[PDB]
Design a protein around this nucleic acid. Structure first.
Ligand SMILES: *C(=O)c1cnc2ccccc2n1
Ligand SMILES: *C(=O)c1cnc2ccccc2n1
Ligand SMILES: *C(=O)c1cnc2ccccc2n1
Ligand SMILES: *C(=O)c1cnc2ccccc2n1
Lengths: 8, 8
DNA sequence: GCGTACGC
DNA sequence: GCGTACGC
């Protein structure tokens, strides 16, 4: 759920 | 030569 | 519940 | 001349 690339 | 992952 | 970020 | 970065 972590947004470091994807943002879900 | 750009270091944003790799660093060469 | 998915994918970003770059040039000596 | 290569590869990093993370969990609601
Ligand atoms: C957040 O913890 C999280 C964990 N697993 C995932 C798997 C696939 C897409 C997004 C996800 N987000
Ligand atoms: C971003 O797109 C992305 C893709 N894979 C990962 C793996 C581990 C940590 C962070 C990540 N971020
Ligand atoms: C830096 O500009 C640069 C450009 N191309 C590369 C290709 C492969 C590895 C490292 C590189 N660094
Ligand atoms: C870091 O490992 C990495 C890998 N691929 C890329 C593509 C485009 C811009 C930056 C990147 N960084």
């Amino acid at each position: 759920x972590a947004x470091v690339x994807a943002x879900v």
